[PDB]
Design brief:
Chain lengths: ~5, ~150, ~5, ~5, ~100, ~50, ~50
């Protein structure tokens, strides 16, 4: 759900 | 009953109470001051300019005050400008509404504050602070940036 | 980078 | 103390 | 009624009414002062423009209030430096996912 | 209430911008961006940084 | 052509078409109402206050 960095 | 000179200057009294009842002071070029008794009005007309120069100017009215122009309205002051109302205060324009201050800008409003627009841009230079009770941000694609890396939601 | 609490 | 829901 | 109207004074100007004050213009309205500029109302303050609304200040900007809400349609941008976000409950929600921090 | 409504854009430029909501602050609209150099989000005791 | 009073109250007409031309209503302290026929102006002046 997240793609941090 | 009248008094006239050879240039055309006039001071006239009209006694007909069934119409045209009042006092007139005028000249042929088009400057008029008319006191109307049938309607209880005062009219001042100048073809070019009307100037009111004094130390203080006071306008007192028990109803509306209307100012209308076909061009700009200017208000220049060497001190504060104050505007107070017991109802709403509308600032409406058809092109733009710009507010520039050489110091601070303070928007303090009890109860609610609302801002609606197509695009919102907030541009800081030193710090951007968002302090509140509960903070919530929405959006279909929210990105947190800064320095090297970033967080994508 | 991302310094968590 | 962080969710990912 | 004239072509131009000028009011020059060495001291204050006071306009008082028991009803509305209306200012209708075809070109522009300008208000310039060397000191403060206070816009006060005890019921409501409303602004509506068919264009961009600009706020400029060569100092800090403060917006004190309650239930501050911001609405957009295309983009919301927060640019600057040393950005900070505070609050007891801080939820960041996206499309089919969210984080509560 | 105070209403700032525009139909093209809204642009704010200042040295420091501070928002203090006594109860609630909400941000809505697609394509939200938060940027800068140091970004912090806090809470009871949580403190994350970028 | 004028009408004057022992304290200085004046109502005056000037017929000099090239030059000073108009109507004035004034007293000696500084209150003037002047209808300028040459320039098509109306000027109202008071040392202290004007009230509408």
């Amino acid at each position: 759900g997240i793609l941090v960095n | 009953k009248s008094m006239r000179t050879r240039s055309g200057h006039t001071l006239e009294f009209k006694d007909d109470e069934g119409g045209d009842w009042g006092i007139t002071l005028r000249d042929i070029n088009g400057n008029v001051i008319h006191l109307n008794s049938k309607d209880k009005n005062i009219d001042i007309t100048a073809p070019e300019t009307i100037t009111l120069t004094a130390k203080n100017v006071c306008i007192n009215t028990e109803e509306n005050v209307q100012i209308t122009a076909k061009k700009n309205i200017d208000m220049t002051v060497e001190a504060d400008i104050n505007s107070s109302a017991k109802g709403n205060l509308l600032l409406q324009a058809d092109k733009d509404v710009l507010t520039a201050a050489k110091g601070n800008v303070g928007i303090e409003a009890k109860s609610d504050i609302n801002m609606v627009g197509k695009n919102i841009a907030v541009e800081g230079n030193s710090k951007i602070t968002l302090n509140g009770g509960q903070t919530q941000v929405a959006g279909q694609q929210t990105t947190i940036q800064g320095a090297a890396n970033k967080i994508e939601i | 980078g991302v310094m968590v609490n | 103390g962080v969710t990912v829901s």
